[PDB]
Amino acid sequence: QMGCKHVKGILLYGPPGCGKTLLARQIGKMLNAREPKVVNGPEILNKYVGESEANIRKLFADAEEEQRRLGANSGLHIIIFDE
Amino acid sequence: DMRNELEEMQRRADQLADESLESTRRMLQLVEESKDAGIRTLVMLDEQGEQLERIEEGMDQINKDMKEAEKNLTDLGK
Ligand SMILES: Nc1ncnc2c1ncn2[C@@H]1O[C@H](COP(=O)(O)OP(=O)(O)OP(=O)(O)O)[C@@H](O)[C@H]1O
């Protein structure tokens, strides 16, 4: 009835050693959802032309399919970008 | 700061063919001709087998007739 959308982003910043990765891990394990995807730094780069963008596109392929199929009854998909 | 980096492009070597369209067609034509020859040989062989089977009965009949005639003639002679 309120007709509102959901938030789709969080950013954490601060000095080293103050507990950022721990919070992300605990958030990931707090939600009854799929197994979160994890990207460790520049893990997507590739030397062939047009191959480092397909890697980006590949992360949303399950969310898009489930959204198309089940509509508004789908689950939650988490993605974690480290560094 | 003369540190350069590159990216790569790829090319596909032509697939395995361009020699499978000249000997191939001749091979197929020869196979068709051999198939036709084999069919003709089948027909001729069946006909020959039928004719041999036909010959057998006349052979047996003539053998029996000659044997019976010889036995009868011998019996009357003595
Ligand atoms: N608030 C906290 N409560 C309990 N333990 C903590 C807390 N913050 C940090 N730690 C301890 O610090 C360890 C490592 O910290 P963490 O990796 O979370 O830091 P970080 O902020 O990601 O650092 P970096 O800047 O290097 O990424 C954790 O495994 C935990 O043992």
End-to-end CA distance of chain B: 135
Q: Is A70 in the pocket of ligand 1 (CB under 6 A)?
A: no
- Resolution of the entry in angstroms: 3.1
Task: Return the structure tokens found at B51.
Answer: 């004719």
Question: Does residue A61 belong to the interface with chain B, where contact is any CB pair within 8 Å?
Answer: no
Q: Return the C-alpha torsion angle A40, A41, A47, A48, nearest 10.
A: 60
Contacts of A72 (CB under 8 A, 6+ apart): none
State the closest ligand 1 atom to the C-alpha of A22, by its place in the atom list counted from 1: 18
Helix (H, G, I), strand (E, B) or coil at A38: strand
DSSP A39-81: EESS-S--SBTTHHHHHHHHTTHHHHHHHHHHGGG-----EEE
**Looking at ligand 1, which residue's alpha carbon is closest to its atom 27?**
A16
> CB B10 to CB A47 under 8 A?
no
Inter-residue contact B34 to A72 (CB < 8 Å): no
Q: What technique solved it?
A: cryo-EM
Amino acid at A52: S
CA–CA distance, A21 with A30 (Å, rounded to integer): 14
**Looking at ligand 1, which residue's alpha carbon is closest to its atom 2?**
A19
CA–CA distance, A29 with A36 (Å, rounded to integer): 9
CA–CA distance, A12 with B13 (Å, rounded to integer): 49
CA–CA distance, A44 with A54 (Å, rounded to integer): 9
Task: Name beta bridge partners: A81.
Answer: A39
Find where tokens 């969080």 sit.
Answer: A10
3-state secondary structure chain B: CCCCCCCECCCCCCCCCCCCCCHHHHHHHHHHHHHHHHHHHHHHHHHHHHHHHHHHHHHHHHHHHHHHHHHHHHHHHC
Chain B residues whose CB is inside 8 A of the A47 CB are 6-8
After which residues does chain B become discontinuous at a C–N distance over 2.5 Å? none
Pick among B4, B5, B6, B8 to test the A interface (most A CBs inside 10 A): B8
Inter-residue contact A78 to A31 (CB < 8 Å): yes
CA–CA distance, A47 with B10 (Å, rounded to integer): 11
By C-alpha distance, which of A25, A36, A83, A44 is closest to A62?
A36
